[PDB]
Amino acid sequence: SMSVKKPKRDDSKDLALCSMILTEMETHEDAWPFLLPVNLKLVPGYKKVIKKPMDFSTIREKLSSGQYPNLETFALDVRLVFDNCETFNEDDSDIGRAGHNMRKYFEKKWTDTFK
C-alpha cells in the first residue's frame, strides 16, 4: 500500500527471454497454422466466431514495438492463439493437434524460464 512495497522481482531480462521463447515457437515444425493472421476474407465463419484473432507475427510486432507492458500480457496473447485454435478446430484434425502440441511446448518453456 502507500509507502509499503514488496521486494523488487528483477524484470530487466523479461523482453529478451520472451523474444527467445517466441523464436522457439516460430521455428517449431507444428507452428505453421499460427505464423500469420487467418485470412478473414477466405475462411468462412472466422470473423464472426473468433472475437480476438491472434497469431505469432502479430505477437512479434507487438513485442518489437513496446506494446506489451509486462510478461503476463505477452503470455495472454500466446494463450489466445491456442484458445482460438481450440474454438475453431476439432481436436482430431491436423490443426487441432498442432495447437495442443504448441500449447504444451510453450507452457514448459514458460515454467522453465520464469517459475
Listed residue (11, 18, 25, 20) closest to 75, CA to CA: 18
Q: What are the respective helix, strand and coil percentages of the chain, to the nearest 5?
A: 60, 0, 40
Domain boundaries, the chain: 1-115
Please answer whether residues 97 and 91 qualify as being in contact, where contact means their C-beta atoms are separated by less than 8 angstroms: yes
Resolution in A: 1.7
How far, in whole angstroms, is CA 37 from its chain's centroid? 13
Written out in words, the top-level CATH class of the domain with range 1-115 is mainly alpha
Instruction: Look up residue 49 and give its three cell numbers.
Output: 466466431
CA 41 – CA 43 distance, rounded (Å):
6
Residue that is written with C-alpha cell 474454438 in the block = 87
**Residues of 43-66 as b/e, b for ≥16 C-beta within 10 angstroms?**
eeebeeebeeebbbebbbeebeee
